[PDB]
């Protein structure tokens, strides 16, 4: 689909009564020196059209809360992103309805627990309309200097700690939400920091896959290297191997797949993510990591060496003037 999803001018609608996540977005906005809040409005069916207090820096301001999505859309035609905090029961309906509004180009789906058969339908329709789905079951992602999905990256002290208020040159994609904030921390300690990070969520069929974002990153000139935190389950990571073999993927990629421990268990263990289940030998973390390594991907020995190889690749990119 698209290459750029977010900018410092991106305006979002939040579906749901998530004043903490919205406030945290606005705090991010303010220290990134955005001209305007990234949340134009909130939709909440459980209440009628009203207004919520929020803080823009020290200044109290007002975000409109709408009962109907069609009002929010019509009033705020500048919005091209929706962050859907609808519970699992409602997420399918509201997400289908969002994609009746051509202004929306990206949807984050936060909820865990959406049936896979429904997510596949979401994917068919998103694919139809060119809409980019991040999720489900994800905290979202963060584009330093530009935009933050929901709770991603936590409160200000962490935004400042990991230097997520300006872009570096390292993009990443993760299945894990919590680990995306670890990557934020590792990358910022080993490089000039994150350019863009996306958590695709743990579900069997994520709305956008690893390769979806790896390609976007390959085509973003601000991106000079790419990190992928893969995971046992499915065969997505092999598309990376393909994308290098074909010459489509030229920027250095570091990648590590979690779930190696599953090879050592005498019985199948379902980890926390709904997709983190190998159904054939190739779906194992160990097999995937080994295939990535032979394809030209920079693969550390264990998660423990992850930071070290990132830094290794980054330093060589500086030495040769790519960064």
């Amino acid at each position: 689909k698209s290459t750029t999803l977010f900018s410092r001018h991106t305006k979002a609608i939040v579906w749901g009564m998530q004043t903490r996540a919205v406030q945290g977005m606005l705090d991010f906005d303010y220290v990134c020196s955005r001209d305007e809040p990234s949340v134009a409005a909130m939709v909440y069916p459980f209440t009628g059209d009203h207004k919520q207090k929020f803080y823009w820096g020290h200044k109290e301001i007002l975000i409109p809360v709408f009962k109907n999505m069609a009002d929010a859309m019509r009033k705020h035609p500048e919005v091209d992103v929706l962050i859907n905090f609808a519970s699992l029961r409602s997420a399918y309906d509201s997400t289908m309805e969002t994609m009746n509004y051509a202004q929306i180009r990206t949807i984050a789906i936060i909820a865990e627990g959406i049936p896979e058969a429904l997510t596949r339908k979401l994917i068919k329709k998103a694919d139809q309309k060119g809409v980019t789905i991040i999720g489900p079951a994800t905290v979202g992602g963060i584009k330093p200097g530009c935009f933050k999905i929901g709770n991603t990256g936590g409160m200000l002290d962490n935004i400042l700690a990991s230097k997520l208020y300006r872009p570096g040159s390292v993009a990443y994609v993760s299945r894990s939400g919590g680990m995306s904030n670890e990557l934020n921390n590792i990358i910022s300690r080993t490089t000039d920091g994150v350019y863009e990070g996306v958590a695709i969520g743990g579900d069997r069929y994520p709305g956008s896959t690893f390769m979806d974002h790896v390609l976007r990153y390959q085509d973003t000139p601000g991106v000079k290297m790419i990190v992928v935190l893969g995971e046992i389950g499915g065969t997505e990571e092999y598309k990376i191997c393909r994308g290098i073999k074909e010459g489509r993927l030229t920027k250095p990629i570091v990648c590590w797949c979690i779930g190696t421990c599953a090879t050592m268990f005498s019985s199948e263990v379902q980890f926390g993510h709904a997709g983190a289940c190998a159904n054939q030998a190739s779906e194992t973390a160990v097999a995937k990591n080994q295939a990535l390594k032979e394809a030209g991907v920079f693969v550390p020995r264990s998660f423990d060496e992850l930071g070290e190889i990132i830094q290794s690749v980054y330093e060589d990119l500086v030495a040769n003037g790519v960064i």
Binding site: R89, E116, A117, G154, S174, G178, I258, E268, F303
Partner: protein
Amino acid sequence: SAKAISEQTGKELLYKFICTTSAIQNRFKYARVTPDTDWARLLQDHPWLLSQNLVVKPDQLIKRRGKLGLVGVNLTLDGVKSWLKPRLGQEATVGKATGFLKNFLIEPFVPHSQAEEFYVCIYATREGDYVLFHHEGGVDVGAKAQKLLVGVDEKLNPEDIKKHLLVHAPEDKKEILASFISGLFNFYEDLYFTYLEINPLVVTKDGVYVLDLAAKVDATADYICKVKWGDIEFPPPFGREAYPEEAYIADLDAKSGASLKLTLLNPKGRIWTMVAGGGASVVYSDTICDLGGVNELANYGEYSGAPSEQQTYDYAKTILSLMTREKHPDGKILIIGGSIANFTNVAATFKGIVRAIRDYQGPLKEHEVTIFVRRGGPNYQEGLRVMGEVGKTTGIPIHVFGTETHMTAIVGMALGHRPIPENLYFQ
């Protein structure tokens, strides 16, 4: 996640709900037997067990039972009881899993030729559901079956099945095969299956017999499907047993949007984890095992999604109860770890853990439990303080680390590979 169901569960659902023009034979003719069965009562409930010969086989998510000598074919009831004597209640290894054979199924034997065995499978992928058919069903099924992708919004009519899938099928069987498969596919969809395999499906002059069934359903669809699923059960893999702690934690997980998950791998293991986050909990597990400790890893478990202090206390109390059931020469270890949380209130959660440590301080000391903590996220400094504080006020040794330590370093610590750097405490 998608979760396997027993053959018995799947067959009851199919017998209840499939719509076909086919006469499906032997509906609901199956009996369940365990080491505790009252066979007099069994035969009171299932007089058909005397009416013809039988088949007996374990119903515990074991594949390839025939190749394992675990299918008793064409036996009298007495022949069944003889076949079960060396098996029922016995420990058995399948692949690399070891468990007790404790749950078996008995069904009418169905005479037929090998030409009457058919393979049918339906399984989910991103782009839709594949439907597989082969006119060589059976244990020797071994890129040779007919296979058709049914798209996310596509329908599968008998007419489509004869067209795409039944090309190699006996002409006289096409109509009944097509009807059954269309019905099976409708059943599969309406009840949110993600995998459904019947190998073999038998079709004789008398109709359609379902001799074997393996299936997974998308357990997240309970809210849609509960009326038809009923009190559906999701058995552990062969090789594991179910503990009330797991069912306890699961009940907790079902009440809030917060995730709370526990799997016991080795109750006698000295290495326990209470990690925040799906990915992180995996990673720590990866590390504990990369560092040799797989045989001592007691559990896979993760909380996340901002559990309340109460939810967090009740999780931790379960862990602390399970590692104080039995002492160990070398004591025990607890890895209280996680990434840098995005939004989980570390102070609220660790205050739940502290209070649980406080309640179990006595037992924890008598099992020589040593605790290692690493965590980031909202209010994590106050989180760490209260872990250090309970450590002093109980005598337990708690080693508290922050965003300045690498996430998994604490595991190398807890296992002796590396020294404990006290120059990173609470940082």
